[PDB]
């Protein structure tokens, strides 16, 4: 086909630069790291009032103590989560300790660029991934939020938002949040940017929030407990 | 000739033309013409002679693979004609197949069977464009055990049949007709004559001539069925005789 080895004279891939535009049409995800937990926010994308928030999630379990909220292209997120889930469970038998939020993000980051037009294998691709994932979980070093992106780089962040506008959703988050603060203020800060960047506005079946504290397991929130977080936008 | 029309993706692929031509094979003939090597081969009843030119770029050489005479098995010997790079790869493949024959057959292989194994292998190359055919040409010489001396020629493709006398190289057709007159005139086959008739033909077609050191003659005599290179001395013996011969 038309070049999939394509470098610019600056020295980056055109194809990677193309990958971001896909994320922008997709879903919106907020991850905030708190001292007192990690809270994860994600767009459910309502479009009927018949879609049940308790039965279906897009906050999903990597481990029983670790969560990941997805953004951008949905199909692409699933492939990264299934390899990451096994790596995590295999880690638990062997070490007998929960996997660092950083440890899982590094593994997925390998997949992002390895593409080429021909000589492709499962470890390689025909075009780079356009999803950014927010892996949030509590480990022995404390609550951490690590951020993985389409360029296949891992960075520690105490607040990252990626969605309809990646940089836009992160600039709203830069104004509100402060580094060290209470759980309710972090949960409030995640919802608040979310409705403004989106076309869609804040409801209790519009978005999905689940919170991981340290000393707790991953809990996906009940119908009532999802509605409690809505009162403070 | 034809360069073919595509209806598949024939242009860089070996697959058919309306001539029946295979693109990679026709390109294999142009590989012969690159090397500059031309060979004249003569069959007798005393011996089978292959005589071919030895390339000299400079006078600092060792002769062990500058040589285009190769031992493809101890009794039966051969030359590769054409581009020297393609020749070395083919010689290499053939020798592993030859050794395989040694494990299977257990002995010295007939000239008919030796050419047939190389032909089947080269069928793999010819059908592929995955790996381009090797654009060398092999003339096997040797004494088939009951029949006598034989000269067989395989093309890059692998087409082989018997001939009274054969030629390979930059131009097959021009060399053959010169050789055909030598064949009509059918000389008394003894050692001195069969070598000499081969040597005279290769020199007439070029019209450059040579000294004995400049060519390499390889014979398979009834005297010793071993494949033997004459060397500078023995070829010289024919050359001096040849001058006195009309």
């Amino acid at each position: 086909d038309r070049g999939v080895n394509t470098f610019s004279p600056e020295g980056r891939l055109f194809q990677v630069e193309y990958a971001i535009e896909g994320h922008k049409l997709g879903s919106t995800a907020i991850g905030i790291q708190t001292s007192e937990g990690v809270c994860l926010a994600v767009e459910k994308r309502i479009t009927s009032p018949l879609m049940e928030p308790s039965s279906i999630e897009k906050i999903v379990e990597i481990d029983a103590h670790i969560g990941c909220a997805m953004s951008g292209l949905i199909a692409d997120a699933k492939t990264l989560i299934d390899k990451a889930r096994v790596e995590t469970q295999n880690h638990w038998f062997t070490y007998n300790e929960t996997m660092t939020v950083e440890s899982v993000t590094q593994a997925v980051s390998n997949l992002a660029l390895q593409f080429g037009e021909e000589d492709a294998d499962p470890g390689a691709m025909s075009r780079p991934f356009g999803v950014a994932l927010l892996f949030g979980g509590v480990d022995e070093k404390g609550p951490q939020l690590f951020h993985m992106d389409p360029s296949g780089t891992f960075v520690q962040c105490d607040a990252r938002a990626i969605g309809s506008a990646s940089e836009g959703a992160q600039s709203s988050l830069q104004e509100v949040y402060h580094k060290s603060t209470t759980l309710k203020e972090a949960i409030k800060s995640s919802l608040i940017i979310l409705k403004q960047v989106m076309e869609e506005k804040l409801n209790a079946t519009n978005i999905e929030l689940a919170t991981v504290q340290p000393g707790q397991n991953f809990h996906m929130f009940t119908k009532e407990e999802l509605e409690e977080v809505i009162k403070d936008i | 000739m034809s360069r073919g029309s595509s209806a598949g993706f024939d242009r860089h692929i070996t697959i058919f033309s309306p001539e029946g031509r295979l693109y990679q094979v026709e390109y294999a003939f142009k590989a012969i013409n690159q090397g500059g090597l031309t060979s004249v081969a003569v069959r007798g009843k005393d011996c089978a002679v292959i005589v071919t030119q030895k390339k000299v770029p400079d006078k600092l050489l060792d002769s062990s693979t500058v040589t285009h005479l190769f031992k493809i098995t101890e009794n039966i010997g051969c030359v590769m004609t054409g581009m020297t790079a393609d020749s070395r790869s083919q010689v290499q493949r053939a020798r592993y197949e030859a050794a395989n024959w040694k494990y299977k057959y257990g002995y010295e292989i007939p000239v008919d069977m030796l050419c047939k194994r190389i032909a089947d292998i080269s069928q793999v190359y010819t059908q592929n464009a995955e790996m381009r055919p090797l654009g060398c040409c092999m003339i096997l010489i040797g004494i088939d055990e009951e029949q006598g001396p034989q000269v067989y020629k395989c093309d890059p493709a692998g087409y082989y049949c018997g001939f009274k006398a054969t030629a390979a190289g930059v131009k097959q057709t021009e060399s053959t007709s010169f050789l055909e007159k030598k064949v009509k005139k059918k000389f008394d086959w003894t050692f001195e004559q069969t070598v000499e008739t081969a040597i005279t033909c290769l020199s007439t077609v070029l019209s450059i001539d040579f000294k004995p050191s400049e060519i390499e003659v390889g014979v398979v005599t009834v005297e010793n069925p071993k494949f033997r290179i004459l060397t500078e001395a023995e070829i010289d013996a024919h050359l001096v005789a040849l001058a006195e011969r009309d």
């Binding site: - | 309306p18 592929n128 464009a129 995955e130 087409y159 082989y160």
Partner: protein, 234 residues
Amino acid sequence: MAERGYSFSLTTFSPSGKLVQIEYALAAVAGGAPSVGIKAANGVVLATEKKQKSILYDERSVHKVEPITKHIGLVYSGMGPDYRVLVHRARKLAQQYYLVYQEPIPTAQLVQRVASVMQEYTQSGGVRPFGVSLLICGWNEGRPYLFQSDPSGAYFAWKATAMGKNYVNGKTFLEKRYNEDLELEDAIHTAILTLKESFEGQMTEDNIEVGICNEAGFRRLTPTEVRDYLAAIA
């Protein structure tokens, strides 16, 4: 180390009951060597052009008339390398039959199995199907038989057919002409006359090559013999 290059289909269907690239292969056998085959009904005789038109030919075993086994012979028209593999494969197939049955491979069966590789090479990318067509003879069922296997892999059943230069014209002349109830000696005489009609130029005995299949078994006629037949008939 590894090879790729060409692995997508090279062959596209044409509305004619055949693909484009195979149709082109059948022209290749036409520009091939003249080979004629006639079933005499007390053996099959097959005759082929010995030459590759250099007219230095010195055959003692290097033939294009080859016994595969006890009662199967092959003569071809088209490509040399493509043919050598079919001969090597044929013996392995005949023997494959010889092990199970304790008789070698019937004409019909050998054709089914050779035909499957020739098609294989079509559908697959990075390969091309043979440029060879076979005149296959055999004695099975208590009757001589003769089959034609084309470079496509299709088979056409023939009591007499001609290949090589003017093949098309060759088939119509045979379709009308074909004979049966022929003595062995006559079989050769008819076969040579048909070869005269396909093949141009000189015929002597280092220009044409003849092989016969009968009850005693397939063998390949000595260059002296062919000459005596050739002279005999008008």
